[PDB]
């Protein structure tokens with residue numbers, strides 16, 4: 001079995017890369033540990049940058065998104081009994097963000113891939129990577145008990161945080177940067193209309209809360225909870241009572257509640273590895289970096305890693321410029337670090353941290369007061385929120 | 395002995411308030427623990443905001459400053475082998491800062507006060523404050539062994555961080571916010587021409603360094619040093635060698651060194667008290683708050699506290715609007731907290747902190763890269779550096 005680019009992981013990253021590659025004539029095979037159904041069960045992302053929206057259009061998978069996606073021109077931040085709106089469009093020079101669930105984006109790509117007839121092996125068990133520095137690397141996996149080998153020119157590790165690709169790079173060649181936060185996000189999906197037409201991020205003494213959405217009749221809410229919490233201790237009723245307690249009274253007042261379609265706790269973490277490649281293996285998305293959800297940058301960074309890898313691979317195949325691939329990491333990391341900085345900043349000003357002294361609490365509040373009340377402060381949030389520009393290459 | 399406003403402390407705050415008051419016809423007496431010579435020996439500040447410059451003009455003490463002061467339109471920040479200039483004037487909408495030593499400003503005010511014949515008691519020993527909540531407060535002090543009493547209507551505590559005024563407010567009525575940094579600034583004054591026409595703040599792996607000035611032939615340099623250092627362990631030669639090691643090679647190359655006229659270590663600290671008044675006692679300047687020097691806000695915040703107190707006292711005396719004085723703290727604290735936030739931010743991005751993990755070091759570097767490379771980021775630094783606007787009152 002042979003292909004040009006072997007892709008590990010059928011999440012957004014792998015599917016997007018595969019689609020862009022297939023369309024340009026570069027054969028690729030995707031290997032996924034789970035089933036199509038399992039991948040589709042993951043709720044995750046709701047906010048997309050314009051760069052991601054354009055990439056989906058380039059991959060020709062934007063019909064449903066253009067129809068069903070919601071374009072947002074602003075977002076709200078509530079703190080100390082007041083709501084402040086950040087006009088993203090005005091402050092960023094015209095850019096906006098699009099609310100379209102990750103489940104939907106993944107569904108669209110999966111359908112697009114099937115229609116084109118490109119190769120995808122689900123339930124590819126025990127994927128192993130070999131000869132990463134040779135001229136002929138290969139991947140081995142198990143399908144129903146028999147060990148199969150897939151030869152390729154390059155391997156793109158799009159297998160997420162717990163994937164095999166990052167583990168395959170000799171640990172001594174990698175530099176890891178990580179911060180674990182002492183809290184997580186308890187999320188709840190409901191078939192109820194959102195409380196607002198725009199997102200509301202709330203810093204409240206009891207903890208952080210976020211009112212998001214998926215469509216006109218589907219909402220997604222989150223509340224900060226300590227790491228010791230188990231999802232089974234949070235009944236739907238306990239969640240709604242808690243969410244209401246963390247929102248401004250006039251917002252809590254018009255909130256339509258309902259049974260949860262999904263509930264889960266996601267721990268917050270920052271993680272980056274340098275470099276993002278090794279020989280003929282290139283890491284993309286959650287395989288190379290994790291950002292806390294506060295900034296809505298994760299899936300969006302994966303999109304830029306992919307956009308970059310795809311363009312470099314095109315140059316390598318179409319133009320015989322294989323040496324440009326050595327620049328992958330340097331190009332990606334520039335954008336990754338600025339997005340990590342933004343996600344870290346958002347996280348630190350919106351959440352309540354344990355054992356915080358009086359000085360820090362006051363500085364936290366003043367950070368909000370300053371950035372939300374200054375035209376220059378508002379602009380720094382806005383340009384980062386809509387997403388910083390992608391790098392050209394070369 | 396009787397007056398209208400008793401002022402404790404003959405540093406910049408007390409002298410400026412006294413001068414503004416005297417000029418408006420409100421009698422005031424200043425009590426100072428030290429001698430004129432001792433006060434004049436303190437080097438301290440070099441950078442003044444435009445608001446402070448205007449206040450000095452209003453007090454009619456700006457002749458020498460207008461002649462000798464240096465107007466700066468920009469400042470430089472060096473980090474990771476690169477120098478980035480922040481165009482203050484362009485980015486702040488036309489404002490600049492003025493470099494005029496605190497020693498000089500204090501000298502100008504002292505001369506101005508003497509010429510007008512206003513009362514100033516130097517070597518006023520053991521100042522005590524009494525009947526702060528009565529309609530008739532009074533101050534007692536010792537002059538050559540005899541205890542004297544000074545009756546007044548109001549008392550302005552302009553006695554700095556170690557003054558008696560803040561100690562006179564029942565501890566239970568005060569809320570203190572404080573952060574002590576694990577390092578100090580070793581400063582050196584020399585009769586040598588500055589290495590640059592504008593200030594250079596440098597974040598270097600060995601520690602922070604700052605190239606400042608007092609005139610065309612007088613320089614002021616600083617290097618971050620741990621709290622365990624004693625000034626006697628730093629010979630002039632050790633200082634120059636260290637400073638040179640922390641600056642970009644092309645800057646170190648043209649640095650003119652020379653014998654120190656003054657050397658001292660100043661520990662870094664953030665401190666604020668709420669409220670800033672009690673009965674007929676009002677705190678101003680370092681008596682109510684300390685900001686680390688990194689942002690050049692200390693003397694500048696004292697100026698705004700004074701501008702505010704003076705205007706409220708005018709209303710009280712001239713207009714019989716004594717009730718407006720209850721607003722002093724609320725007005726001052728708004729500006730104080732934003733300046734504290736700025737000084738804290740500058741301090742955290744420019745200095746090297748002990749036991750810093752890899753993630754934080756990278757975030758520190760990315761903060762600099764972001765704010766120094768974005769038009770909106772540059773504007774947040776600039777508007778804060780030139781000084782945020784004073785509040786109108788009423």
Ligand SMILES: Cc1cc2nc3c(=O)[nH]c(=O)nc-3n(C[C@H](O)[C@H](O)[C@H](O)COP(=O)(O)OP(=O)(O)OC[C@H]3O[C@@H](n4cnc5c(N)ncnc54)[C@H](O)[C@@H]3O)c2cc1C
Nearest residue numbers: 009011012013033046047159160285286296297298299300
């Ligand atoms: C609560 C939450 C909210 C978020 N909100 C947002 C948001 O609004 N906006 C945004 O930009 N980001 C957001 N994110 C982040 C975003 O969901 C992720 O960054 C994104 O899923 C990354 O996609 P990926 O394809 O890189 O990895 P994944 O989605 O993790 O997919 C990796 C795939 O690889 C497969 N795989 C793993 N191991 C193997 C193996 N050994 N062999 C083969 N296949 C394997 C996995 O099964 C998986 O299907 C959020 C995340 C969370 C958890």
Ligand SMILES: Cc1cc2nc3c(=O)[nH]c(=O)nc-3n(C[C@H](O)[C@H](O)[C@H](O)COP(=O)(O)OP(=O)(O)OC[C@H]3O[C@@H](n4cnc5c(N)ncnc54)[C@H](O)[C@@H]3O)c2cc1C
Nearest residue numbers: 403405406407427440441553554679680690691692693694
């Ligand atoms: C290294 C350094 C650099 C700085 N750089 C700058 C800068 O460039 N720009 C800026 O804005 N700020 C800067 N500052 C801060 C600035 O110097 C101070 O904020 C400023 O001195 C405050 O003035 P003040 O009048 O409130 O207090 P002080 O200058 O401390 O004067 C208070 C006076 O009260 C007197 N006194 C004390 N106790 C008694 C008592 N019990 N009875 C009677 N009198 C008493 C003291 O003797 C003193 O004379 C810097 C400070 C340092 C240390």
